[PDB]
Design a binder for these strands. Sequence first.
DNA 1: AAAAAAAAAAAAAAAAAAAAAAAAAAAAAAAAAAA
DNA 2: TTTTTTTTTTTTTTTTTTTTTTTTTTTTTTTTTTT
Lengths: 372, 285, 401, 56
Amino acid sequence: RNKYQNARRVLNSAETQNLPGRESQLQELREFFSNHLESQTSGSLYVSGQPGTGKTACLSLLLRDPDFSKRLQRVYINCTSIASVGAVYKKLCTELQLKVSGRTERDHLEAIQRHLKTAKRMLLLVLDEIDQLCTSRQEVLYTIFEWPALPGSRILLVGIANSLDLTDRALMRLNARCELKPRLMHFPPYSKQQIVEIFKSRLAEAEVLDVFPPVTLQLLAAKVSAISGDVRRALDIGRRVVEIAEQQKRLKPVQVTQVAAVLNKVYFPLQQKLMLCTLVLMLRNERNKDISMGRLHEVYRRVCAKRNILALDQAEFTGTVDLVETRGILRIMRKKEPRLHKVLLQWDEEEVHAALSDKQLIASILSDTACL
Amino acid sequence: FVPESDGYFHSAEHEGSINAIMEEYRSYFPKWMCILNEGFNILLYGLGSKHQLLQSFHREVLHKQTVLVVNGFFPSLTIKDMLDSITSDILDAGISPANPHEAVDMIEEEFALIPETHLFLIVHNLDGAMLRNVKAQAILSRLARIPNIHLLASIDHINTPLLWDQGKLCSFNFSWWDCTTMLPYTNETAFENSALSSMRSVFSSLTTNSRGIYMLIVKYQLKNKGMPFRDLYSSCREAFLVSSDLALRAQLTEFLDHKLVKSKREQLTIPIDGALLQQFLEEQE
Amino acid sequence: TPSQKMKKIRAGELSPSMQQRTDLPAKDSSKSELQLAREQLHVSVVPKSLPCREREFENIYAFLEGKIQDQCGGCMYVSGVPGTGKTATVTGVIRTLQRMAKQNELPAFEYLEINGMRLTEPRQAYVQIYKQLTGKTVSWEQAHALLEKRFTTPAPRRVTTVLLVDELDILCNRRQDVVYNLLDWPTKSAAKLVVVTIANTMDLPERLLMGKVTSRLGLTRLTFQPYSHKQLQEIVTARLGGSETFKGEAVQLVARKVAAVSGDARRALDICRRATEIADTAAVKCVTMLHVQQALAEMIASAKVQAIRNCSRMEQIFLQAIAAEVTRTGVEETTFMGVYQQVETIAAFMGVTFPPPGRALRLCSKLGAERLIISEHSRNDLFQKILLNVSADDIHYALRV
Amino acid sequence: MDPTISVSKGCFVYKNGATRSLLGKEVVQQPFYEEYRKAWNQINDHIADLQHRSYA
DNA sequence: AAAAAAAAAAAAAAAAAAAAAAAAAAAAAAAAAAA
DNA sequence: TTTTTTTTTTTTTTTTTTTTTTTTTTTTTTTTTTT
Ligand SMILES: Nc1ncnc2c1ncn2[C@@H]1O[C@H](COP(=O)(O)OP(=O)(O)OP(=O)(O)O)[C@@H](O)[C@H]1O
Ligand SMILES: Nc1ncnc2c1ncn2[C@@H]1O[C@H](COP(=O)(O)OP(=O)(O)OP(=O)(O)O)[C@@H](O)[C@H]1O
Ligand SMILES: [Mg+2]
Ligand SMILES: [Mg+2]
């Protein structure tokens, strides 16, 4: 209806047509495809980058290119959609309309190898999230990456993953032959100005540019480009700002204080208080940080008996420490008996002092060394 | 070769000669077929790579018989793969049983039904990386004992007959041949079984706050010539380089993944000497 | 034949009926006021408007109404300790939205719901999502294929679908393909799928989910804080209504002694029901404070002193001697041989004779059955390790006092 | 480096008519192979006779 | 040249999840019963 | 000759067992001090 819901709709965090931040990468991928078409030679490629950097959007924009649609056969396979690692031959046979005798994976592999031996168009096999094919033996991934070396085969394949060195770590044997090792292409994370241009393209797509002045965009991009650099978190904070401001103001452009509050937002019971204070006291006074549940419960009971508050038994104390584990202050290493579970504090002590906010009780518990 | 025990207690023209050597070993092939006819097996124990000689034997002589070439220098073959290969591809009998000696029992009972169907078995590097246990050599000795199956093999490791006892050596009816070529091990050492620049290349891929965390680690290691987790967390929270503890833990786990920080018990050392860390810190300023 | 009945069950054509009572249930007019309070204080009786969760209701309602009206799809993650009104508030939001959709104030939508702990595998989420669309029970491979053909292909007029996923931590495994599939389908423009994910831990996306799954999960999150003593009293006095059956200080005691431990609402609504059951058998019509005190002593149990006091004489000598061996050696884990030496010392002091080490092993197994001590299998006699599960001061509180 | 060596497979089958007397007629019909076979069959039957007579 | 002890690295349990093998149940073709 | 019934095999699906990973703890070897 109004500009706020239009902005919240148009940010959308979904598949697009224009990619302003990826211009050299798309030209490089087009040059790779055109140079391997014009020589009619096969070539592997492994593109990588941080999650949210523009890989799947680029290679979905290029699998709708009409000239590459006419010159070669495009195949897209997402690799979390397979029931097992060896089912990628079945999925590729289903995507290429091959006729198999069936009911063994080796016959699907033979059908793909016969389909690569003869040809009429070049094959483009894009395997997205290729880290899901990695196993112990890696017969599947080494079988797939050897298809450019197959005689007469014309498949040029692209593997997309998040790991910068997956072809070096999990494909060590491909370095032994220069015919086989894939050309690498890193997708670097977005800077400040690239995220600014992505916002200014997505807002000019529906002419809703007046909601964001440039200063708040250059603050939000300055934080998100420094934290992770992906555009999904940038568009998520940019959508959350507008959906908070619509709740707040119901045409007012979003202020710097609103995006600052949302950015610092993104980037207790009594017995849990008494448990956290005794854990801080036991870690401060003792250099052995291997605290068991029974050894913590014994100090907790004396601290409670000093303040004349009725203490829980071991059975309620275990559930209390389990509820403090959910907040992220602790990590409980599990053992064979519940008395022997190991509590590990995962905050520094000043965060606990600021989170409990009961310094009159905290200073009283930390000064009582004698109950340990 | 008669070794002395006192050493243990006190502690071009070449290509033409190699071609003449290879022709001389190429002359042995009818005698090898005559030897394989009488139930013996061929074993080669020369210095260099004998891959090309066995490939030339399979090409020039055994161009019409059933042949199972087994690359034992492959770092990822299993004896189950070779047994399934025999059972499914030669005999069309499906996948072999999961216990390998029962699979060799079924291979013997099936090959006893079909005489005059010889299976030649060419195992490059019989002492290969996954055939060096007692079980795979027991399987291969039980396979070579079959009169239909004829075996050729190569050995390169010097400690190879330590895993053959007298029963395996009686099943392996070997005829030993000194096929010493001087060819280098190109294929056999190519596999997986046999840094400042990488640090810079993975450092260019990190974001700004990741670079700042790593510069804090570098500055601490250069000042003290392994830093604790609490000092790193305090220095990260001071410069606002992290939001909480768990993001720093995930970032340091990512640092362990790309081989930049080594964790010890939290001690976080960089496995790089101090002068290169000083030149690297001058590179970032 | 039952096989045709099961083929009808997989097709979803026969309703899974349950047996009906032969006798008609009791009428509401026969119930006492204590009985009406006991059936209103049940935890299965949810109110139509939940007290003290108005802000979280507004947040989830604005989120889901915006994602329905924009026809875009996205994701959310709400979290909090159990008993804090997460699933009740989410289903209240979705019931309000369905009431708006039936009155044509909102576009109509589909509501699928699963639970991570009602599944035997994480892969059965594909079976249970597809079962709520068609009614058919299929394998998870065919259900995954049909859900991908539903969500990835554009087909007007696709209706908006809202998928609530309780217990998200059970759907995680090592491979994380089910949670990646459920959070990846909103990113496609052909799928108007809005995913709401409920779990307990606040830091689940960073602890055990991967980087791309945490990227797809977003940052639009909500946390349900535990109930304070004011809110947890307001809930119970809302459940009681205008009745005068509970005293005002009794509900305050329940809220003050439950909110200090967990903040659970089920704990307070069960302790008040137990207090009502205590007041029923005392032949009174009001639930005064000492009924609540007896119920608080019963529900928040501490019955290790009662076990040590009712142990036999040789069991109590054994329990004194394990603590004596802990005091002597310093370490907490004791072998059986030093315990038996201290046993014979304490029995010689006390004037009794002790059983031989075989019957002492029987005593150790009997105490380890109650988990008063932690002990091994008795195949390694005289060298098995004996932890003391109860504290050493409870033994001296039970055997002296 | 060759097409025969693969990076994925370890075993390679060259089945030629396999179902479920190795040399040719040029050497078997030669007299030296016939006399060798006859002498070996005599000596092997004699050693088998001696071993059975020792074990009986 | 040889002994020891504080810490680091190889290994040893173990425990938790997954790959694969077995077992069973459902579906496609086969062979007999029968109209 | 043509429709229906029952068998056998094959295929798919589920369950159990073995293997692999992954975390924690122990044991062996190393580096550095002492004789
Ligand atoms: N350069 C860009 N310009 C505009 N929008 C973009 C750009 N890059 C990405 N996006 C949008 O942000 C989202 C990022 O998803 P994308 O397909 O890039 O994931 P990805 O990089 O493959 O991450 P992962 O590997 O974790 O799946 C997409 O929905 C896309 O529409
Ligand atoms: N604010 C409230 N007002 C009234 N009743 C409540 C309130 N919060 C919870 N309850 C009652 O307590 C019970 C809580 O169950 P609920 O489904 O809310 O658990 P949850 O908060 O989703 O946590 P989990 O499912 O992890 O245990 C419900 O049956 C409800 O009747
Ligand atoms: Mg992607
Ligand atoms: Mg719930």
